[PDB]
Amino acid sequence: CPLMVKVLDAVRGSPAINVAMHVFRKAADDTWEPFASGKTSESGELHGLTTEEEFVEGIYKVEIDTKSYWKALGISPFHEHAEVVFTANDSRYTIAALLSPYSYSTTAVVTN
Amino acid sequence: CPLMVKVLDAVRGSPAINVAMHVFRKAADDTWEPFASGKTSESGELHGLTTEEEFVEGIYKVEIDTKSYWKALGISPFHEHAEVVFTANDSGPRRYTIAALLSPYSYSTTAVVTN
Amino acid sequence: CPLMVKVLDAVRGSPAINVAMHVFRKAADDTWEPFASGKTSESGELHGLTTEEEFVEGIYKVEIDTKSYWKALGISPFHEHAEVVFTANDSGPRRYTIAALLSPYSYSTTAVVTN
Amino acid sequence: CPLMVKVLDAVRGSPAINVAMHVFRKAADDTWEPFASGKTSESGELHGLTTEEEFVEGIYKVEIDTKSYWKALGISPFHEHAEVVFTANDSRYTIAALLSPYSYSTTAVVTN
Ligand SMILES: COc1c(O)cc2oc3cc(O)c(CC=C(C)C)c(O)c3c(=O)c2c1CC=C(C)C
Ligand SMILES: COc1c(O)cc2oc3cc(O)c(CC=C(C)C)c(O)c3c(=O)c2c1CC=C(C)C
Ligand SMILES: [Br-]
Ligand SMILES: [Br-]
Ligand SMILES: [Br-]
Ligand SMILES: [Br-]
Ligand SMILES: [Br-]
Ligand SMILES: [Br-]
Ligand SMILES: [Br-]
Ligand SMILES: [Br-]
Ligand SMILES: [Br-]
Ligand SMILES: [Br-]
Helix, strand or coil: CCEEEEEEECCCCEECCCCEEEEEEECCCCCEEEEEEEECCCCCEECCCCCCCCCCCEEEEEEECHHHHHHHCCCCCCEEEEEEEEEECCCCEEEEEEEECCEEEEEEEECC | CCEEEEEEECCCCEECCCCEEEEEEECCCCCEEEEEEEECCCCCEECCCCCCCCCCCEEEEEEECHHHHHHHCCCCCCEEEEEEEEEECECECCEEEEEEEEECCEEEEEEEEEC | CCEEEEEEECCCCEECCCCEEEEEEECCCCCEEEEEEEECCCCCEECCCCCCCCCCCEEEEEEECHHHHHHHCCCCCCEEEEEEEEEECECECCEEEEEEEEECCEEEEEEEEEC | CCEEEEEEECCCCEECCCCEEEEEEECCCCCEEEEEEEECCCCCEECCCCCCCCCCCEEEEEEECHHHHHHHCCCCCCEEEEEEEEEECCCCEEEEEEEECCEEEEEEEECC
16 A cells, blocks of 8 residues: 555544545646545545555645545634645655644654 | 745754745635745744735645755755645634644644744 | 743734643752743743853753633633743753743644754 | 644654653652653654553653754754643543754644
């Protein structure tokens, strides 16, 4: 699994479940091509986005729909979405995001 | 000053100086129009981006150029940039301060919204 | 002002006002001596804790009373308090600004150290 | 496993390995009694700190020795250690910490 995303809720101290996200790859013309999407599981994780053969080097954007997550919990948030934009480099990627209504953090753990 | 950005460097324990950022506003056709741009000062702040009159309701994207920042210091970071996307002014004018704390493989961003 | 603390609330997008904090300095016998205390203002800042003369080298603990803060708002948080422990002034006097961003189950803290 | 700790390094984008920590329980006289300790594994995790029978309600402190971690990497950090102080309440606890030299964040995920 080359690319995994994990989302945590800082208000409830829980996995952020049923959070939608879309992954985009940057195309030669600088537009964002849909690449992969899904919703986090009960453990706040989204696995199976892509495969090692498909996940070639390039710039990707993960757009996490944080606004709908907070709306379904009855809480007005600041951001429209969270965006994590990175280059995938051949020299496993776990993207993590901690959500608060007016703040979020994101970190990448890149391992073997 | 209705929209200010402050950036901090978590490796050095200092303001993040000379960080470039581009602000965009979503147009009627769903594209991102350029709105304002600038770079942080020696206190890590960027003031004067826009005015109360020009900062009307809309969806704004602050794109902070973190990769350029870290590269200029010889560090190869993870992200291309930090993106802060939010609806502004949709219950009347507010003042926004967006903060970002930068590490090479992580960042955090928060907004303080006053009236 | 050699030691300032700024606290932000990540649920409300605001300064964290009336947050109490106690600063301790490690004594020769390895115990924590009370050093200064105060509470944040309406801008979420606490200034005037100490003076250049009194803030000598040592190991300091800033204990931020986050549980009292959240409880006063009807939220049951996870932490008792946020603790920031650091050696100060050990290459000469510096100015420290400690920031903390508070959520009910998480917090972050950063220091900016100037000379 | 009632109590797990996970530590991540924000400079290298990696698990923080071989990080020492000690866990204390608050005693009736307000002192901190040693309770459990260990070092994070290759995956940045420390499991097996305590058992469900021993982990009774009370106030605990996890002291993460972040200073020695940065020192062994040749980097001068700000904090002496990171401290996470919480009440364990019978109404599984995963404590996570993201380390930077001049900053850290910590979150709790409390699940069933
Ligand atoms: C918000 O703090 C947390 C947190 O509560 C849980 C976290 O869980 C993670 C789990 C992971 O497997 C991995 C990958 C580690 C490998 C060795 C592949 C993680 O990086 C995390 C977390 O980063 C994590 C975090 C910290 C992330 C933030 C504060 C954006
Ligand atoms: C939560 O992210 C914020 C934030 O929203 C506001 C912040 O305000 C600061 C103001 C400051 O003057 C200084 C000192 C900079 C000097 C040149 C002395 C700050 O460091 C901050 C912030 O740290 C700050 C932050 C980031 C702090 C976190 C993420 C714990
Ligand atoms: Br949008
Ligand atoms: Br640009
Ligand atoms: Br300047
Ligand atoms: Br890009
Ligand atoms: Br602010
Ligand atoms: Br006290
Ligand atoms: Br005041
Ligand atoms: Br306590
Ligand atoms: Br100490
Ligand atoms: Br977790």
